[PDB]
Design a protein around this ligand. Structure first.
Ligand SMILES: C[C@@]1(O)CCN2C(=O)CCc3cccc1c32
Length: 312
């Protein structure tokens, strides 16, 4: 499950070889190309690293803090140089300059799945099959190689590219950065995390299940759509506090019947069991009928993606 094919190994090696050529990251070495979107705590820009010529994604977090705090943040982010996986967004480095922390990472030309979803309307089950494999693999990697859980799985934290790669980003590695920042959505948080109770990688599986239902139906799935709302979709307002209460108190969302395969439906159901002990784990998810089927499917994710978003 963590072993790599020839292509994956080669791309991972090529990234590291290019990264080695970049030295210390400095503010004045960046030329702004465009705005990629906004992440929690700051804006993400597509940039040119002038000396190396490398195109990067630069996230800028505005923080007015003492040299003590920022130097500790930068050191804590250094842990990202150790995360090397086809399912994790490549990291270049982090620095502080004139009231803002910069996190420089690999450019993903397909952007986030939250952006792809807006464009597509809804994402096909076979495409969600590849997405599920990449998320399980990224979460397994983080857990097994670094003893870390994501803590913030959502469609805006799943990045995609024209080579067909799917990678996770914005997993909390710096405690100090979270404290100083600290304000992202709690709408993908598991019922146990919202109840302050017992929380592990099982809470990330809930967030993945919820993100998958959202992408499949083309709508944040809580509260569930009524009989008339589903007819407009396939043919076949709640304030944040009300929503969080609904998650904790009500049955979990589910895919509509007779539109998706029973394997996909069962897969999301197992991710969405409210009790984390009963909820499927990464090991069980890796061998789920939906995962085994999707893994054997020869799905052109890059082709689908480029056609959908008008990339090219
Ligand atoms: C979370 C992130 O900042 C990662 C970088 N990124 C990209 O490379 C593509 C566009 C994008 C949109 C929203 C958030 C991000 C990105």
């Amino acid at each position: 499950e963590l072993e790599l094919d020839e292509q994956q190994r080669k791309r991972l090696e090529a990234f590291l070889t290019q990264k080695q050529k970049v030295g210390e990251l400095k503010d004045d070495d960046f030329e702004k190309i465009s705005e990629l979107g906004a992440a929690n705590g700051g804006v993400v820009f597509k940039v040119s690293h002038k000396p190396s010529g490398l195109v990067m994604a630069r996230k800028l977090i505005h923080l007015e803090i003492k040299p003590a705090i920022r130097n500790q943040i930068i050191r804590e982010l250094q842990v990202l140089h150790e995360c090397n996986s086809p399912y994790i967004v490549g990291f270049y480095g982090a620095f502080y300059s004139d009231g803002e922390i910069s996190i420089c990472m690999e450019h993903m030309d397909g952007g986030s799945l939250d952006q792809v979803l807006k464009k597509a309307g809804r994402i096909p089950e076979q495409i969600l099959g590849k997405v599920s494999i990449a998320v399980i693999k990224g979460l397994t990697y983080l857990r097994e190689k670094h003893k870390i859980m994501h803590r913030d799985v959502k469609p805006s934290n799943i990045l995609v590219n024209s080579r067909g790669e799917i990678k996770l980003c914005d997993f909390g590695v710096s405690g100090q950065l979270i404290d100083s920042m600290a304000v992202g959505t709690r709408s993908y948080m598991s019922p146990e995390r919202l109840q302050g109770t017992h929380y592990s990688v099982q809470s990330d599986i809930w967030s993945m299940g919820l993100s998958l239902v959202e992408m499949a139906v083309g709508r944040y799935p809580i509260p569930p759509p009524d009989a008339k709302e589903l007819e407009l979709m396939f043919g076949c307002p709640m304030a944040i506090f009300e929503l969080l209460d609904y998650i904790v108190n009500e049955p979990p969302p589910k895919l509509p019947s007779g539109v998706f395969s029973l394997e996909f439906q069962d897969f999301v159901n197992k991710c969405l069991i409210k009790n984390p002990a009963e909820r499927a784990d990464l090991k069980q998810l890796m061998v789920h009928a939906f995962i085994k089927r999707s893994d054997a499917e020869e799905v052109d994710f890059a082709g689908w993606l480029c056609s959908t978003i008008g990339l090219n």
